């Protein structure tokens, strides 16, 4: 599935893994994907999130409250949570339905919203960003 990703989408997932590592987390969850979308900085997802007032520090703060720093450094390669796998699979489906044969940062964010149930979704709502508004912003920046 990674072979469909744009270079900047690949960067999102790489940064998600680095954020999980920094937090001493044992899985790449949806919240790490959200942090990766922000860290990537330049894509439609990052720009959408900046527009909606969703900051790297706000998300990190929420993740610290909900999950907390782990005590032991994990390995270089961290597995995805089931929910994060689902998000990636849905990102593909978003792209396909919109007529794209590639997965960009926009599609990863749309997939995160489509899944809508995991830690990232909980954090977005806690930070004042209803999922529906997030999708509209993405679609808007795309149009």
């Amino acid at each position: 599935m990674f072979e469909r990703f744009t270079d900047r989408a690949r960067r999102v997932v790489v940064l998600a893994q680095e954020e999980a590592k920094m937090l001493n987390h044992n899985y790449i969850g949806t919240e790490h994907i959200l942090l990766g979308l922000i860290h990537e900085g330049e894509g439609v997802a990052a720009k959408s999130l900046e527009s909606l007032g969703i900051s790297l520090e706000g998300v990190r703060s929420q993740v610290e409250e909900i999950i907390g720093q782990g005590q032991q450094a994990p390995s270089g390669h961290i597995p995805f949570t089931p929910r994060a796998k689902k998000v990636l699979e849905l990102s593909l489906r978003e792209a396909l339905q919109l007529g794209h044969n590639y997965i960009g940062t926009e599609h990863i964010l749309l997939g995160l919203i489509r899944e809508g149930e995991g830690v990232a979704a909980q954090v977005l709502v806690k930070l004042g960003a209803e999922l529906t508004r997030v999708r509209q912003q993405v679609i808007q920046l795309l149009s």
Partner: peptide
């Protein structure tokens, strides 16, 4: 990869 056992090239883990 999208599973568990050993390191994918870039991100995640995979099984045999």
């Amino acid at each position: 990869g999208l599973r568990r056992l050993f390191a994918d090239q870039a991100v995640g883990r995979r099984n045999i």
